[PDB]
């Protein structure tokens, strides 16, 4: 026996059956490449002295500064209806 698929299977092409509409876009070839690049930048991104600057800024320093601000100013201000001379803070 030669091991081959059964001949009772009748096969044919895939016709999704959409109505092929006219050309309402003129592809440009360079815009598409610019988009492919800006879309798959992640697979070519490399670490260097500017990428590192931006990365450490926006993922170390600014988060740490915002957190220092928060965890100092946690329960500090409370000034609903306050009046002259009264302190707006709950701490020193």
């Amino acid at each position: 026996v030669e091991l081959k698929p059964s001949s009772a299977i009748q096969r044919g092409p895939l016709n999704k059956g959409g109505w092929d509409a006219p050309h309402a876009l003129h592809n440009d070839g360079a815009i598409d490449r610019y988009a492919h690049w800006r879309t798959f930048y992640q697979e070519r991104f490399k670490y260097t002295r500017a990428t590192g600057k931006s990365t450490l800024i926006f993922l170390v320093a600014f988060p740490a500064l915002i957190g220092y601000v928060a965890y100092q100013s946690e329960g500090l201000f409370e000034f609903a209806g306050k009046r002259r001379g009264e302190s707006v803070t709950t701490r020193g």
Binding site: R33, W37, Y41, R44, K46, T48, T51
Partner: peptide, 26 residues
């Protein structure tokens, strides 16, 4: 002229052409 941001992206272009930018306004 290639500015800072536009030549910090040199290592990443791969095959893309490294064009010299010129704003269209000029």
């Amino acid at each position: 002229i290639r500015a800072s941001f536009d030549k910090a992206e040199e290592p990443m272009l791969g095959d893309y052409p490294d064009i010299d930018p010129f704003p269209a306004q000029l």
